Amino acid sequence: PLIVPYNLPLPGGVVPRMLITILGTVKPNANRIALDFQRGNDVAFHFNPRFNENNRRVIVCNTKLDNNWGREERQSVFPFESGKPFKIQVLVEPDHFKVAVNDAHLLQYNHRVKKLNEISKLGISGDIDLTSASYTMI
Template identity: 40%
Template structure:
């Protein structure tokens, strides 16, 4: 898969939406087609009774546009109602329980919607949840995402679909590899399958409010930081005092030369962030909040990376591999 956030956003790649206000209504660039995935990270309010995510055939109203998928968690009954609106009339509700209710009040969540030829598939917090057969068969009509209710949205990201050159229908992400929702900091996990060209690491969370100093994300060739330390193929280290993102590598117990230049410093105390690290054959490339920031040429074989380590003045909401 191509890196999703190159400067200028290549054809078929839609810029992510960061921390939008709710209610939210926004376009889906190039519409919905088989292989399109929508990633939504957010938080359910402590007093939430419900919220909804709609895939719509337009915005505005009245009259209301047709709604191809209405995904509506309801906390009183602990059910997720699914439905379709056509010509101002709702169809029959689907609310069968797949065995669990994946949302909790006062909790973060990630929802993924995958469009396939005959149905939508929805996953929540790393687990496949439901399928919903298309009732609006002309997928090209679906062009708008709308979210409303008692929730806060951190980020919305789009991937895949027929508009991407040479794209094929994408499988639902391999949930054997995550995501980890609200993991503690420090955080350490194995990088199952290692780093290979095209592999991406997604790290999202909040910077601490009170005088944050720094944090770091390491791709290491072994666990821990005790002596003797394992080699670190990539050390990504935002430092708030100097407003710099320091990059480095550790080999044979020695740090190399630091790289510090960045177009800007995107982290703020109390602010939400999403870091994406892409491994390519020549370098690691990093995007922050949907904007390509830096690249770090490999100083050690990326094939030796087997551990992700995160420490410092942040609170994590999610760690995911793709």
């Protein structure tokens, strides 16, 4: 494969028990990946693996409101590797997004944007070959 950046519409927004699955492969020498769950111009949930921030690998999560980034939430557990295939699963739960990578729980992100049914796009960006992006209800 899909063209990156990729826009996946989420019809009617998100809702608890919606599971979003992203399959791809990290490029060689990757620097960054981003998933952006968007409410119009706002980013309800930005999930941003950084492969070289001051020579460290870190996951940064944040929200962008009225074009302003908020307070970052950081996770140093880092399950991605340059050149390797991955699966990201984002399960919407009542009070947070729950993220697993390669079937292992990674992090939760509490809902800052609370109009879940207005979070109606997922952008997928950065240093990946994107194989598929889809959603289902569990």
